[PDB]
Amino acid sequence: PPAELTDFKEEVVLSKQWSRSVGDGQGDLYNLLEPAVDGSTIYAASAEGRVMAIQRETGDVLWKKDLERPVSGGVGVGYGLVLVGTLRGDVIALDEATGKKKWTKRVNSEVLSAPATNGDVVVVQTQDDKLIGLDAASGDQRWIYESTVPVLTLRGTGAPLIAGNMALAGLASGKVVAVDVQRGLPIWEQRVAIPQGRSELDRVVDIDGGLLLSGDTLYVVSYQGRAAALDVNSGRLLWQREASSYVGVAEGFGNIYVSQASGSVEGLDSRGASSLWNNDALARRQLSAPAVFSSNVVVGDLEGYVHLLSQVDGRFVGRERVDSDGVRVRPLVVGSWMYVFGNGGKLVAYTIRPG
């Protein structure tokens, strides 16, 4: 039973600029569809197959597309495409400016995360730990990286990231890899997660490394029950923490901030050595990954609240109910704006009052 909400002295108040419903949001997915921004537009998909492009400051709908099929991985955007994956293993590319379908490629396995693109190749990470590179123009397969090698009881829900000429991925098997984005050949591989054993051969578990790319640092914080940061160019371990682990991580003010779904949020130093503060009060509230919005750390919970915590102290300074079906997706902060995507599909844009 989630911990009851606690009283606090309100110091930070959100101003709701616009809200738009996109389909059924996450529907019955166990994984998450994440909206993404490119320039002045925010793009969002829903489990029912509805995809939208919205002017991110006004809320004006630029285009909608009803794909009429089970979208399970999404939004990828860039270089003129919006990209989603389906539970049937389809990767569908839509024109970023009009929403017109450009192509569809049926891939080997379910796609449970947003494809990435550099405008030449679309990189798709599958439930069964393959990275597939597709031609951005046609969808035709360019390369495949399959060290998978199993396993039927894990689902990888990590999204691939393009750094330079590298595609990075945290695989369900617990290994982070960097491959050549043009050829699909490995550049480095680094085991971060604790090795699997058996005795979870009778259960299906979803695995995500919780990747966050910031410059030369790739944070990998969501493998149980460890957390690490890697050099993006070599895979070298910069630091690690045992006895974790975290729903996700965010940077701000020279520190990092983590949440643990089970209901703590914590600030740590740059190198995750020492703890700056810890707020336990959201005990069983099933937190999203954290975002830093101005001087606040923010997390969504199962009841649909976003909580704002002081970056200095961890104390509650703000709270806003967004979508009562819950907020599981990391709030998306772009400068002075924050976009929260509720489980029922409410996409809401906030600024901090009086701005």
Residue numbers in the entry: 28 to 382
Text lifted from the article:
A multiprotein complex in the outer membrane called β-Barrel Assembly Machine (BAM) then mediates OMP folding and insertion. In E. coli, the BAM complex is composed of BamA, a β-barrel OMP itself previously known as Omp85/YaeT, and the lipoproteins BamB, C, D and E (previously YfgL, NlpB, YfiO and SmpA respectively). BamB is a membrane-associated lipoprotein with lipids attached to the N-terminal cysteine in the mature protein predicted to anchor it to the membrane. Taken together, the structural analysis and mutagenic testing of BamB suggests that its main function is to bind and modulate BamA, rather than directly interact with nascent OMPs.
We report the crystal structure of Pseudomonas aeruginosa BamB refined to 1.85Å resolution. A lipid-free, soluble form of mature Pseudomonas aeruginosa BamB (paBamA, amino acids 19–380) was expressed in E. coli, purified to homogeneity and crystallized as described in Methods. The crystals belong to trigonal space group P3221 and contain a single paBamB molecule per asymmetric unit. The model was then refined against a native dataset to 1.85Å resolution. The final model contains amino acids 28 to 380 (plus two extra amino acids, PG, at the C-terminus resulting from the cloning procedure) with excellent refinement statistics as shown in Table 1. BamB adopts an eight-bladed β-propeller fold. Four antiparallel β-strands named A–D constitute each blade with the A strand being closest to the pseudo-symmetry axis (A1 thus refers to the A strand of Blade1). The eighth blade is formed by three strands from the C-terminus and the D-strand from the N-terminus (blue in Figure 1) mediating closure of the ring. Despite these irregularities in the inner strands, the propeller displays a central pore that is about 20Å wide at the “top” and narrows to about 8Å at the center. The structures of paBamB and ecBamB (E. coli BamB) superimpose with an RMS deviation of 1.8 Å for 286 matching Cα atoms highlighting a high degree of structural conservation despite a relatively modest 30% sequence identity.
